[PDB]
Amino acid sequence: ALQDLLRTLKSPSSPQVLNILKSNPQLMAAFIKQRTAKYVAN
């Protein structure tokens, strides 16, 4: 989840990975949930 996010997200925004995460369905749901333990995705 930690590494895969970098390779998958790569540059899904380029703001001056969290970009998709802020959504919560795809990335935040699947990867953050299996790499930080205390993952928070309310």
Tab-separated table of C-alpha atoms in Angstrom:
chain	number	residue	atom	x	y	z
A	1	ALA	CA	0.000	0.000	0.000
A	2	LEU	CA	2.768	2.465	0.860
A	3	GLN	CA	4.985	1.834	-2.195
A	4	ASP	CA	2.259	0.761	-4.651
A	5	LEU	CA	0.507	4.100	-4.126
A	6	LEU	CA	3.571	5.957	-5.423
A	7	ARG	CA	3.824	3.847	-8.583
A	8	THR	CA	0.067	3.892	-9.240
A	9	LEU	CA	-0.621	7.522	-8.399
A	10	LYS	CA	2.690	8.810	-9.781
A	11	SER	CA	1.306	12.207	-10.799
A	12	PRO	CA	-2.521	12.165	-10.561
A	13	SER	CA	-2.651	15.915	-9.916
A	14	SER	CA	0.718	17.623	-9.475
A	15	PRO	CA	-0.360	20.264	-6.907
A	16	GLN	CA	2.075	23.083	-6.130
A	17	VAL	CA	-0.971	10.717	-3.778
A	18	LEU	CA	-3.242	12.449	-1.290
A	19	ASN	CA	-5.188	13.938	-4.194
A	20	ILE	CA	-6.965	10.646	-4.912
A	21	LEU	CA	-6.934	9.792	-1.225
A	22	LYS	CA	-8.997	12.888	-0.436
A	23	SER	CA	-11.661	11.085	-2.465
A	24	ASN	CA	-11.587	7.984	-0.186
A	25	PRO	CA	-13.083	5.278	-2.518
A	26	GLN	CA	-10.222	3.758	-4.563
A	27	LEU	CA	-6.856	4.577	-3.016
A	28	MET	CA	-7.710	5.677	0.487
A	29	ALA	CA	-10.029	2.736	0.810
A	30	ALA	CA	-7.673	0.011	-0.418
A	31	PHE	CA	-4.019	1.028	0.235
A	32	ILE	CA	-3.864	3.375	3.256
A	33	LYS	CA	-5.973	0.849	5.088
A	34	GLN	CA	-3.236	-1.799	4.765
A	35	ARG	CA	-0.030	0.192	5.447
A	36	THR	CA	-0.472	2.564	8.417
A	37	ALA	CA	-2.581	0.501	10.850
A	38	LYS	CA	-4.101	3.676	12.350
A	39	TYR	CA	-5.365	4.607	8.862
A	40	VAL	CA	-8.091	7.246	9.044
A	41	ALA	CA	-10.499	7.537	6.122
A	42	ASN	CA	-13.701	9.084	7.462
